[PDB]
Structure formats: C-alpha cells, structure tokens
Scaffold this motif. Structure first.
Motif, short mmCIF file in Angstrom:
data_model
loop_
_atom_site.label_atom_id
_atom_site.label_comp_id
_atom_site.label_asym_id
_atom_site.label_seq_id
_atom_site.Cartn_x
_atom_site.Cartn_y
_atom_site.Cartn_z
N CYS A 50 15.33 51.73 61.98
CA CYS A 50 15.60 53.29 62.24
C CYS A 50 14.92 54.04 61.12
CB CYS A 50 17.46 53.54 61.36
SG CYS A 50 17.35 54.98 62.27
N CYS A 67 18.40 56.31 57.43
CA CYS A 67 17.04 56.30 57.89
C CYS A 67 16.16 57.30 58.37
CB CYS A 67 17.38 55.71 59.03
SG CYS A 67 18.57 55.74 59.75
N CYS A 69 13.30 59.73 59.75
CA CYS A 69 11.78 59.27 60.50
C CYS A 69 10.34 59.79 59.60
CB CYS A 69 11.54 60.12 61.97
SG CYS A 69 13.90 59.47 63.10
N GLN A 77 16.24 56.42 66.04
CA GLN A 77 16.43 55.11 65.63
C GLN A 77 15.04 55.50 65.38
OE1 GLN A 77 16.87 51.56 67.32
NE2 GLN A 77 17.76 50.45 65.78
#
Length: 83
Positions: A50, A67, A69, A77
């Motif tokens: 993730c 998690c 990005c 994810q």
C-alpha cells in the motif's frame, strides 16, 4: 534498609520496554512509539504494498501504520497515479 516489592513481571514489551508500576491500579509497560501496540515487539511500518514508493506513516485507527501514496500518485493501495 526497607525492601520495596516491585509489582511487575518479565518484560513482554520489546524495543524500549519499560515497566512502570502504577500503584493506583496496576503496572504499565511502556515501549517506543512507532512500532506496535502495548508490546511494541514488531514494527507496523513494515514494507507494505500500500506504499508503492509512498510514505509509511503511523495511525491509531489502522494497526499503527498508515500507507500514504507518493506525491503525484494515489490509489486505494497506492497503485494509481494522479492526473
């Protein structure tokens, strides 16, 4: 001298496990923040799919890992890119 009994037990906590008896109710086992729950024996910030080159943060909702990005990407994810 006076013997002072320590109301505690063998350390269940790792990564900075410190036993502090709280004479009010029970003893509290402290550990380093940024690993896991009360024992901190493991690290929630393990390599997680993730992340995908993103940012491994922490959080209380999820099991002590968040998690995020990469900047320019965002998925569920973190498998998607930003347009």
């Amino acid at each position: 001298g006076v013997y002072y009994p320590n109301p505690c037990s063998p350390y269940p906590c790792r990564n900075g496990g410190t036993c502090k008896k709280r004479g009010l109710y029970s003893y509290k086992c402290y550990c380093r923040k940024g690993y896991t729950g009360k024992n901190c024996q493991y690290n929630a910030c393990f390599p997680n799919p993730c992340l995908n080159g993103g940012t491994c943060g922490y959080v209380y909702g999820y099991p002590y890992y968040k998690c995020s990005c990469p900047y320019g990407y965002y998925g569920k994810q973190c498998q998607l890119k930003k347009y």
